[PDB]
Design a protein around this nucleic acid. Sequence first.
DNA 1: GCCATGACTAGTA
DNA 2: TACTAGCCATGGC
Length: 151
Amino acid sequence: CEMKRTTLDSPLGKLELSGCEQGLHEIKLLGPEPLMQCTAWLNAYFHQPEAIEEFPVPALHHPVFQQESFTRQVLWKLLKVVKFGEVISYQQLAALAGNPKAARAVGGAMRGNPVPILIPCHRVVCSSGAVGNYSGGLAVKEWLLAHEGHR
DNA sequence: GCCATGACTAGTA
DNA sequence: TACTAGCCATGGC
């Protein structure tokens, strides 16, 4: 567990994904088995979504996944039930994560998301139809949804 | 733990 | 559409 940095180029620009050999700690969209394993998935999602499940998801070494919380399930459930292309409501996820009367929490849960794109906090959307917000600029949410096949 | 937060909502004018 | 009065697991201290 040393936590080193490996940057990479994506159609969204460079994106620094840090982490130790125990797992992936982060993956920031700026303007060591795990990391290089995550690196593969990323290039796969991007230039080869035709079979993104053909690629193993790395280990998530980060305080949010180590303990047991709502934010936990919400994130865990976000990448296990919301597949490539699919879209889901803040609330609808809160259902998956147990407490359905807690969508607003699924929000703080989403911002708490360290591994975007890997854990698609972008497929998440306001029930009102409006494709809500995103930490790394709403622009990115557009492209992503878009690339997944949206208009 | 209590009290303030904010990437949510369904309801109402 | 535009404001709102519930509903929430966090974070702070």
